[PDB]
Design a protein around this ligand. Structure first.
Ligand SMILES: [Ca+2]
Length: 223
């Protein structure tokens, strides 16, 4: 997160860290045994880390649970990043409380101008590299489809939306991938991609979760 603020310990209780010896992607807990992330975060041997604030210090609220199954969207295209969404099933159910909680899936697609909360442990600099140990937060609006397509000609599908600031300075970044975009208490986006971080006229691009609710529910009900 570039240009954000320190969330505070366990203020984002649905935020998860994906760990394969090290943090490499974020995700969102959608019920006691399933996590949603980005398909481009896929790898084998994932451990899901819940209740994290400082990912380098055991602080007392963590739950470490290995993944038993990963399901990349059947139509994921790594060349275009279309359908950049993935489901992860935990080997055992997490213990839910005030500091570890699931986030609700949307019943409708959010509109441009809606203010959302984006979070992650990603890079905090636009020209440089500095990774934080504690969770960072960013409030950003959803941008209109026309401004999104004008910023990324020929690259925005119906499964993507832009959020952020066209003036730059505030954006998600590498290491935030897979993390949540929450608007009005519902998961509306997944950190997907962008050209650099926090660059002028290059806002962040996010997976449009509302298009995948039926696939998520059907998959969870059968796995
Ligand atoms: Ca920790």
């Amino acid at each position: 997160i570039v240009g954000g603020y320190t969330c505070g310990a366990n203020t984002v209780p649905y935020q998860v860290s994906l760990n394969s010896g090290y943090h490499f992607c974020g995700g969102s807990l959608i019920n006691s045994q399933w996590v949603v992330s980005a398909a481009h975060c896929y790898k084998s041997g994932i451990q899901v880390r819940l209740g994290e604030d400082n990912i380098n210090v055991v602080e007392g609220n963590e739950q470490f649970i290995s993944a038993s199954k990963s399901i990349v969207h059947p139509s994921y295209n790594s060349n275009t990043l279309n359908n950049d969404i993935m489901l992860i099933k935990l080997k055992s159910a997490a213990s839910l409380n005030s500091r570890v909680a699931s986030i609700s899936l949307p019943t409708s697609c959010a509109s441009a101008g809606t203010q959302c909360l984006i979070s992650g442990w990603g890079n905090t600099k636009s020209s440089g590299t500095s990774y934080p140990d504690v969770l960072k937060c960013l409030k950003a609006p959803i941008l209109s489809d026309s401004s999104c397509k004008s910023a990324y000609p020929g690259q925005i599908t119906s499964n993507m939306f832009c959020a952020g600031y066209l003036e730059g300075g505030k954006d998600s970044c590498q290491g935030d991938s897979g993390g949540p975009v929450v608007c009005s208490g519902k998961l509306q986006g997944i950190v997907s991609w962008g050209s650099g971080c926090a660059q002028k006229n290059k806002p962040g691009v996010y997976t449009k979760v509302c298009n995948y609710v039926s696939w998520i529910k059907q998959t969870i009900a059968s796995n």
